[PDB]
Design a binder for these strands. Structure first.
Ligand SMILES: [Mg+2]
Ligand SMILES: [Mg+2]
Ligand code: NA
Length: 327
DNA sequence: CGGCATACG
DNA sequence: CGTAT
DNA sequence: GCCG
């Protein structure tokens, strides 16, 4: 009734076990702050299973037979059902370690490893970092200066305005090039913390060298608050606001049209969905999947895809639209 | 017990 | 090390 | 932390 891989089941954006999934994802996040990638994955998977259910979990027995629910995740659900709260989850929420690692990792340019080192040095607040800017990278200085704006959700109305200015710059850099909205917004999200665009051109090869030309034109228009040959660009855009503006994170990605279905699939997510899809491809089908293609290691050949539908078919999976990939 | 996705900047 | 889904 |  419940397949083991998230890519084998539709997962809508809104579901019937929000509180339970949120608690398990706290534990997944905390596992990540401690470098326990294995425990992070299990908690993430257990959370996604609940997102895929057709109704609320009301009794512990309803977890029987569900994949990725063992003693620990089941105990978390049990306590939430009996008391509306899970002691372990609440201890994590208020712990100084969790709050600081979460605060530091959400800085653009700060990963788990950097946040952990700063934590061990006694640092706890953003102003602690600001007072010692000599130890910050140029990327981290940008992320810290813009941290407040980058914490404000991006609205779908913002996305439309950004896509227009991106299309304009893309149109001058390479006539005929196209811009596709990807990421969480393509999955139907109404808010987000960044906007993701995928750029290609219908004539194979014409996209080569395109991203530097796009970036230089965006910068000349005064729209780039920060950015680093290349095919991925992690920028901070200047988004007009009523009587002012705000900083917004935008990712620009280029792919040749031959690889466009794979890049669209990869960059549409969710993150967990893509990990599960690549895991499923390798372990169940013996095929190697990434955002560039799908490789058969036996015949040493790449699978040609003209659409996401092609890719699902070549993996023996039923097609899922982006709005059902919210694992 | 091994494995846990796979890239690019 | 960071970034991305 | 859980699966095969
Ligand atoms: Mg995104
Ligand atoms: Mg992004
Ligand atoms: Na970060």
């Amino acid at each position: 009734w419940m397949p083991a891989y998230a890519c084998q089941r539709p997962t809508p954006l809104t579901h019937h076990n929000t509180g339970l999934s949120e608690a398990l994802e706290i534990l997944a996040e905390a596992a990540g702050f401690e470098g326990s990638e294995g425990r992070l994955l299990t908690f993430c998977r257990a959370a996604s299973v609940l997102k895929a259910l057709p109704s609320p979990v009301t009794t512990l027995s309803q977890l029987q037979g569900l994949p990725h629910f063992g003693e620990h995740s089941s105990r978390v659900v049990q306590e939430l059902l009996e008391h509306g709260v899970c002691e372990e989850v609440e201890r994590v929420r208020r712990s100084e370690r969790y709050q600081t690692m979460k605060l530091f990792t959400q800085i653009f340019g700060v990963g788990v490893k950097t946040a952990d080192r700063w934590y061990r040095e006694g640092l706890r607040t953003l102003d602690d970092l600001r007072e010692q800017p000599q130890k910050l990278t140029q990327q981290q200085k940008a992320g810290l200066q813009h941290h407040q704006d980058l914490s404000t959700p991006v609205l779908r109305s913002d996305v439309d305005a950004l896509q227009q200015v991106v299309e304009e710059a893309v149109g001058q850099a390479l006539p005929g090039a196209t811009v596709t909205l990807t990421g969480g917004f393509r999955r139907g999200k109404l808010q987000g913390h960044d906007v993701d665009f995928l750029i290609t051109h219908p004539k194979e090869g014409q996209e080569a060298g395109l991203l530097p030309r796009v970036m230089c034109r965006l910068q000349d228009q005064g729209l780039i608050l920060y950015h680093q040959a290349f095919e991925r660009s992690f920028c901070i855009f200047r988004l007009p606001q009523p009587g002012s503006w705000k900083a917004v994170r935008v990712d620009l990605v280029v792919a040749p049209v031959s690889q466009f279905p794979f890049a669209l699939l990869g960059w549409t997510g969710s993150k967990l969905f893509q990990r599960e899809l690549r895991r499923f491809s390798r372990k169940e089908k013996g095929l190697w999947l990434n955002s560039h293609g799908l490789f058969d290691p036996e015949q040493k050949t790449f699978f040609q895809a003209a659409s996401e539908e092609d890719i699902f078919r070549h993996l023996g999976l039923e097609y899922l639209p982006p709005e059902q990939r919210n694992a």
